[PDB]
Design an enzyme around this catalytic site. Structure first.
Site, mmCIF file in Angstrom:
data_model
loop_
_atom_site.group_PDB
_atom_site.id
_atom_site.type_symbol
_atom_site.label_atom_id
_atom_site.label_comp_id
_atom_site.label_asym_id
_atom_site.label_seq_id
_atom_site.Cartn_x
_atom_site.Cartn_y
_atom_site.Cartn_z
ATOM 1 C CG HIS A 1 44.253 45.158 34.032
ATOM 2 N ND1 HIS A 1 45.015 44.171 33.468
ATOM 3 C CD2 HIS A 1 43.010 44.650 34.156
ATOM 4 C CE1 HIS A 1 44.273 43.100 33.270
ATOM 5 N NE2 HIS A 1 43.049 43.368 33.674
ATOM 6 C CG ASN B 1 36.706 39.789 36.486
ATOM 7 O OD1 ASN B 1 35.489 39.839 36.422
ATOM 8 N ND2 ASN B 1 37.358 39.763 37.637
ATOM 9 C CD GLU C 1 48.396 44.824 31.979
ATOM 10 O OE1 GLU C 1 47.740 44.581 33.049
ATOM 11 O OE2 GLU C 1 49.650 44.917 31.979
ATOM 12 C CG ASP D 1 41.460 40.040 32.869
ATOM 13 O OD1 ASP D 1 42.331 40.105 33.774
ATOM 14 O OD2 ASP D 1 40.289 39.572 33.085
ATOM 15 C CD1 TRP D 2 40.184 36.652 34.456
ATOM 16 C CD2 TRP D 2 40.858 34.630 33.857
ATOM 17 N NE1 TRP D 2 40.753 36.053 35.554
ATOM 18 C CE2 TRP D 2 41.176 34.808 35.204
ATOM 19 C CE3 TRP D 2 41.192 33.434 33.250
ATOM 20 C CZ2 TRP D 2 41.826 33.839 35.956
ATOM 21 C CZ3 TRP D 2 41.816 32.445 34.018
ATOM 22 C CH2 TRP D 2 42.123 32.659 35.351
HETATM 23 CL CL LIG Z 1 40.435 38.514 37.746
#
Ligand SMILES: [Cl-]
Ligand SMILES: [Ca+2]
EC number: 3.8.1.5
Length: 293
Positions: free
Chosen positions: A269, A35, A129, A105-106
């Site tokens: 990030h 995201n 990350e 991330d996701w």
């Molecule tokens: Cl998020």
């Protein structure tokens, strides 16, 4: 460079077009974004791995050039639903049994969980990350904590569906350097329309496993956390300084994982936008070690 890598291809999954990049031949190397990005995030990293396998990067449902869900609303784009689409897409791409996952991330939550459910098919995992375990409120960075708590409240709809805060503030704010007008454009594209086109960028932070909630994602991440800390699958941990999400306790926990090499690169990030050459080089070297020829 602002240029995308590769050509988008499409596959209908449960009545919806999903977009993906697939270049080259051989055992796959899957790049999975989170995201609020898309395969575009990997454009300057994937070239480093050319000729080492089949390079694949998918756009998650509702993101990048993949279709939006219809109807849309606060119950859509949860982890479980994304998982269903991505599982089915990875099935249809005929991946085989020597898969290298490269996640962010996701994308890491999705990839780690999939790897756990298909452990005998995984040859290596590079992550950065990542959501490596459940967390507490204190584990979010000081400066972003209150905004993420707002997304997770009723204020989220106004913040994200009307004002598009995730794309216009969080994204540039978690990249050390300024993006060019062309790079922003590519990240903005799937979210230009106010309303439900942006739902995915709001549903995601609402899935973050924080302080025990939502409970189903907590449990999934608790399961893959345990497994990963006990898995002999070789791993590449790309650590970011100062980083954002994989810091503190989560970072200490990641460093306990077996059969892991680690490098550290500059970034917050979205580190692909800050040190793409270091990241790409390390991934390539990793894959070379796992696939001597
Ligand atoms: Cl998020
Ligand atoms: Ca509709």
């Amino acid at each position: 460079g602002a240029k995308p890598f590769g050509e988008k291809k499409f596959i209908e999954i449960k009545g919806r077009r999903m977009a993906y990049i697939d270049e080259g031949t051989g055992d796959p190397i899957l790049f999975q974004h989170g995201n609020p990005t898309s395969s575009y995030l990997w454009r300057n990293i994937m070239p480093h791995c050319a000729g080492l396998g089949r390079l694949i990067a998918c756009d998650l449902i509702g993101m990048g050039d993949s279709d939006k869900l219809d109807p849309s609303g606060p119950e859509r784009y949860a982890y479980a639903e994304h998982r269903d689409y991505l599982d089915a897409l990875w099935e249809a791409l005929d991946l085989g049994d020597r898969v290298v996952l490269v996640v962010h991330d996701w994308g890491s939550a999705l990839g780690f969980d999939w790897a756990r459910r298909h452990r005998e098919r995984v040859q290596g995992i590079a992550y950065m990350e990542a959501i490596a375990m459940p967390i507490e409120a204190a584990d979010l960075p000081e400066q972003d904590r209150d905004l993420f708590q707002a997304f997770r409240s009723q204020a989220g709809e106004e913040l994200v569906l009307q004002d598009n805060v995730f794309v216009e503030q969080v994204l540039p704010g978690w990249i050390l350097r300024p993006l060019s007008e062309a790079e922003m454009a590519a990240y903005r594209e799937p979210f230009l329309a106010a309303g439900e086109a942006r739902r995915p960028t709001l549903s995601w932070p609402r899935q973050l496993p924080i302080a025990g909630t939502p409970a189903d994602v907590v449990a999934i991440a608790r399961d893959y956390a345990g497994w990963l800390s006990e898995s002999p699958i070789p791993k590449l941990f790309i650590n970011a300084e100062p980083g954002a999400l994989t810091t503190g306790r989560m970072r200490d926990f990641c460093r306990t994982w077996p059969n892991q090499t680690e490098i550290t690169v500059a970034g917050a990030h979205f580190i692909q936008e800050d040190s793409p050459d270091e990241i790409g080089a390390a991934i390539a070297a990793f894959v070379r070690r796992l696939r001597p020829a």
